[PDB]
Amino acid sequence: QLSSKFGAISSVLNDILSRLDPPEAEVQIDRLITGRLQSLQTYVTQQL
Amino acid sequence: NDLCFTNVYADSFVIKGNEVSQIAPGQTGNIADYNYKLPDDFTGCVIA
């Protein structure tokens, strides 16, 4: 699930950072962070 | 009206017409690169 875009420009942080302005890049990073954190939470609950 | 300013500052600029759009948080361009830089989390107002 690290390769899923989650409705973003890309799935690699480096390209997002060195492709857009700081505000839109921050928005994209926030979306990616939310998706990955939900993935971790789901995995942890299943493990529990 | 309340809780408005703590360390308020005023700045005076003189630029061209097709240049005010380049003066904003996170902006890029010659004026932002070499003349004046605004912080990304700039909590203020711009008057032109």
UniProtKB/Swiss-Prot annotation, chain B:
Residues 16-18 are annotated as: Integrin-binding motif. Binds to host ACE2. RBD also interacts with the N-linked glycan on 'Asn-90' of ACE2. Cleavage of S generates a polybasic C-terminal sequence on S1 that binds to host Neuropilin-1 (NRP1) and Neuropilin-2 (NRP2) receptors. Interacts with host integrin alpha-5/beta-1 (ITGA5:ITGB1) and with ACE2 in complex with integrin alpha-5/beta-1 (ITGA5:ITGB1). May interact via cytoplasmic c-terminus with M protein. May interact (via N-terminus) with host bilirubin and biliverdin, thereby preventing antibody binding to the SARS-CoV-2 spike NTD via an allosteric mechanism. Attaches the virion to the cell membrane by interacting with host receptor, initiating the infection. The major receptor is host ACE2. When S2/S2' has been cleaved, binding to the receptor triggers direct fusion at the cell membrane. When S2/S2' has not been cleaved, binding to the receptor results in internalization of the virus by endocytosis using host TFRC and GRM2 and leading to fusion of the virion membrane with the host endosomal membrane. Alternatively, may use NRP1/NRP2 and integrin as entry receptors. This is Spike protein S1. It comes from Severe acute respiratory syndrome coronavirus 2 (2019-nCoV). The chain holds residues 388 to 435 of 1273 of the full protein.
